[PDB]
Amino acid sequence: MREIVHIQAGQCGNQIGAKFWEVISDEHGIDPTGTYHGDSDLQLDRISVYYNEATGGKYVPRAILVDLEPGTMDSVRSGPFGQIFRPDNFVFGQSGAGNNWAKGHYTEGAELVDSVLDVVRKEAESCDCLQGFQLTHSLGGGTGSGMGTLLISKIREEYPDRIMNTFSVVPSPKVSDTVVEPYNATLSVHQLVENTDETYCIDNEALYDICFRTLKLTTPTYGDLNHLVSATMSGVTTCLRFPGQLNADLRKLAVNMVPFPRLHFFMPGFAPLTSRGSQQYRALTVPELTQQVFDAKNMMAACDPRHGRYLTVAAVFRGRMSMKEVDEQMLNVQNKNSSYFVEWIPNNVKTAVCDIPPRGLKMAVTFIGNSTAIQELFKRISEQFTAMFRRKAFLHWYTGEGMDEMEFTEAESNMNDLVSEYQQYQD
C-alpha cells in the first residue's frame, strides 16, 4: 500500500539516488544481493512501499535510472548496492547533452522520454495504490534540468492526482563548475512551479558548510553530501514505513505545508549531527535536537532564514519520546523567535512522531521549512541571468536547437513573479 516511484536523472541525481538506496536498504535489512537479513519484523511489513517482491523472496527496488551518457550508468552498476536495480530499468542515451537545456528538453532527450514513460507506466501499474513520484536531479546541467522537466510534465499529464516531490540541487553563488548554468536554472524554475507539489532545495555550499563546521571533516567529498541528502530523503517518508503516535504522510505534510499553490519551495534539515570527537560531551535529548534543527547554520539551503519569516515548518521526529516535551519545546520555539514567523497563521508548526528510530541512533528529526528567505536563492540567479542576456552570450548553443528568444524572457519573468509572490506575504 502507498507505493512511491523513484526517478533519477543526471550525474548528481544518479549518485544521490545510489546513496539513498544504500541507506534505505540498510534500514529495511536488504542485502546487496536482494535477500532479507533483518532483526525486526516491522522492517518487512511495508517493504512494498519502495520494493517489489520477485521470486525467491528477493526484493527489487522500484527505481528508474535515466541519463543521456552511458558511462554514469556503469558507475551505478559497478558499485555497492548496485546489482539490485532491474537490468531493464536502466534507460540511457549516447551523448550527455553537454550543458544544454535545449538539447535535453527538445532535441536529443525527446527520443528517450518515450522509453522512460514506458518503464514508468510498467512500474506504476504493478502497484496496489500509488502514492506519488519522487525524483532526484540537479538543476544547472543539461540532462538533469531538461529531462526532468520534460518527464515531470509528461507524468502530470497522465497522473494529475499523485504527489510529485522533487529533491533538486540549485546553483550556488560561490561554488560553480559551469559557465552557462544560470541559463538552465532559470529555464527550469518555471516548469517546477506548476508541475510539482513539494520541492526541496539543496545547494552544495550549504552541505559543505555543514561538513566543515558541524562535523569538522577534513576532506568532504561528494559522498558526505549525498549521505546527508539521503538522510533527509529517508526521514520524510518514515510515517508510511514504520508505526508511531502522530503519523503524517506526504499528503498531510503538503496540506499543512502549502498555504498557497505556488508556495511549495521548502528547505530541509536533519537534527542529530555531531563530530566524532564530541558525541560523548553532548546528551541526545529532545531540547538539543530541536535547538540544532532550527539553527541557521544547520540548514541545507544557502538562504538565511533570519532575513525572512517562516510561513510554516513541519518536523518529523523518530524514536521513543514523550508528546509533552515535543509540544512544549516547539511551542517555546515560537514564543522566543516570535518575529521570525508570520502572524496571520497561528500555530506555524506541524509535528509527527514515528516510533522506530534510525539504525545506530536513539532519536532523530527531519525538518522541512517553508520560509520567504528562499526568494534569495532565486533572486541571485536572476541577476546572473540578466548579466548574460543584455550582452547575449552562449545563446547560440541554445537557439541552435529550436529554442526561441521569447522563452528566455517568459521564464525569467515567471521567476520574478514567483519571487514577488514570496515577498508580498512577508510584508
Partner 1 sequence: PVTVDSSKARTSLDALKISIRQLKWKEFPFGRRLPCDIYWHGVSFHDNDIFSGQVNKFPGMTEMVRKITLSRAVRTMQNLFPEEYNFYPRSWILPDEFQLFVAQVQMVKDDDPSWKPTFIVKPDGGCQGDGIYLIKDPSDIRLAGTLQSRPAVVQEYICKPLLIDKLKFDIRLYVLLKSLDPLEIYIAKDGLSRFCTEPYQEPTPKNLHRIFMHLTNYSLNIHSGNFIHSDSASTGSKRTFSSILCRLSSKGVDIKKVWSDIISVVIKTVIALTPELKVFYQSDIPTGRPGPTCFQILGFDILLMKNLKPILLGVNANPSMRIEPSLVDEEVKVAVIRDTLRLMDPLKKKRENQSQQLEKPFAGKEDALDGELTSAPDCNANPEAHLPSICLKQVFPKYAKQFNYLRLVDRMANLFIRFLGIKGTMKLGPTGFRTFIRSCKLSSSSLSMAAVDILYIDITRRWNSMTLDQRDSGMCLQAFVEAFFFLAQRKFKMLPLHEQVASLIDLCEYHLSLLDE
Ligand X SMILES: Nc1nc2c(ncn2[C@@H]2O[C@H](COP(=O)(O)CP(=O)(O)OP(=O)(O)O)[C@@H](O)[C@H]2O)c(=O)[nH]1
Ligand Y SMILES: CC(=O)O[C@H]1C(=O)[C@@]2(C)[C@H]([C@H](OC(=O)c3ccccc3)[C@]3(O)C[C@H](OC(=O)[C@H](O)[C@@H](NC(=O)c4ccccc4)c4ccccc4)C(C)=C1C3(C)C)[C@]1(OC(C)=O)CO[C@@H]1C[C@@H]2O
Number of residues that bind ligand X (CB under 6 A): 22
Of residues 231, 153, 164, the one with CA closest to residue 198? 164
CB within 8 A of 264, min separation 6: which ones?
196, 197, 198, 199, 254, 257, 258, 370
Which CB, 275 or 413, lies closer to partner 1? 413
**Pick from Mg ion, ligand X, ligand Y, none: which does 25 bind, CB < 5 to 8 A by kind?**
none
As for the chain, the residues directly before each break of C–N over 2.5 Å are none
Q: Which does 160 bind (CB under 5 to 8 A by kind): ligand X, ligand Y, partner 1, none?
A: partner 1
- Phi, psi (rounded to 5 degrees) for 275: -75, -165
CB of 249 to ligand X, least distance (A): 27
Other CB atoms closer than 10 Å to residue 153's CB: what's the count?
14
* Buried-exposed string 23-37: b where 16+ CB fall within 10 A, e elsewhere: bbbebbbbeeebeee
- Region class of 391: left (phi > 0), else alpha (psi between -120 and 50), else beta: beta
Give the shortest CB-46-to-ligand Y separation in angstroms.
16
What CA–CA distance (Å, rounded) separates 88 from 90? Answer: 5
Give, for 227, the enclosing helix (H) or strand (E). Answer: helix 222-236
- CA pair distance 100, 355, nearest whole angstrom: 46
Using CB positions, name the residue nearest to ligand Y. Answer: 360
- Return the residues of window 197-256 that contact ligand X according to CB under 6 A: 204, 222, 225-226
142 lies in the site for ligand X, by CB under 6 A:
yes
User: Pick from partner 1, ligand Y, ligand X, none: which does 323 bind, CB < 5 to 8 A by kind?
Assistant: none
CA–CA gap between residue 264 and residue 200 (Å, rounded): 9
Integer CA distances (angstroms), 79 to 73, 74, 226, 315, 371, in order: 10, 9, 15, 33, 38
- Among positions 166-185, residues that touch ligand X (CB under 6 A) are 169, 177
Q: Which is nearer to ligand X, 226 or 348 (CB)?
A: 226
- Partner whose footprint covers residue 274, from ligand X, partner 1, ligand Y, none (CB < 5 to 8 Å by kind): ligand Y
Selected range binding ligand X among 78-86, 142-150, 159-167, 383-391, rule: CB under 6 A: 142-150
Dihedral sign for Cα atoms in the order 181, 220, 235, 83: positive
Judged by the rule CB under 6 A, the positions of this chain that interact with ligand Y are 22-23, 26-27, 215, 224, 227-228, 231, 234-235, 272-274, 276, 279, 358-361, 364
Q: How far is the CB of 113 from ligand X (least distance, A)?
A: 15
Among ligand Y, ligand X, partner 1, none, residue 403 binds (CB under 5-8 Å by kind): none
* Residue 7 CB, nearest approach to Mg ion (Å): 17
The site partner of 96 among partner 1, ligand Y, Mg ion, none (C-beta below 5 to 8 Å per kind) is Mg ion
235 binds, among ligand Y, partner 1, Mg ion, none (CB under 5 to 8 A by kind): ligand Y
Q: Is 138 in the site for ligand X (CB under 6 A)?
A: yes
Binding residues for GTP: 11, 69, 138, 142-144, 204, 226
Residue 273 partner contact from Mg ion, partner 1, ligand Y, none using kind-dependent CB cut-offs of 5 to 8 Å: ligand Y
Q: What are the φ and ψ backbone dihedral angles of 362, each rounded to 5 degrees?
A: -120, -40
> Which of 195/238 has CB closer to partner 1?
195
Q: Which stretch binds Mg ion (CB under 5 A): 4-12, 17-25, 258-266, 288-296?
A: 4-12
> How far is residue 363 from each of residues 34, 155, 290, 308, measured CA to CA in Å?
28, 37, 11, 29
Closer residue to ligand X (CB): 142 or 357: 142
Q: What's the full length of the chain, in residues?
A: 427
Tell me the CA distances in angstroms from 361 to 9, 24, 239, 272, 279, one per residue in order: 31, 15, 17, 9, 11
Q: 65 - beta bridge partners?
A: 8, 90
CB nearer to ligand Y: give 27 or 407: 27
* CB of residue 292 to ligand X, shortest distance in Å: 21
Site for ligand X in 14-73 (CB under 6 A): 15-16, 69
CB of 90 to ligand X, least distance (A): 15
Residues 206 and 301 sit within 8 Å (Cβ to Cβ) = yes
- Where does this chain bind Mg ion (CB under 5 A)? 11, 96
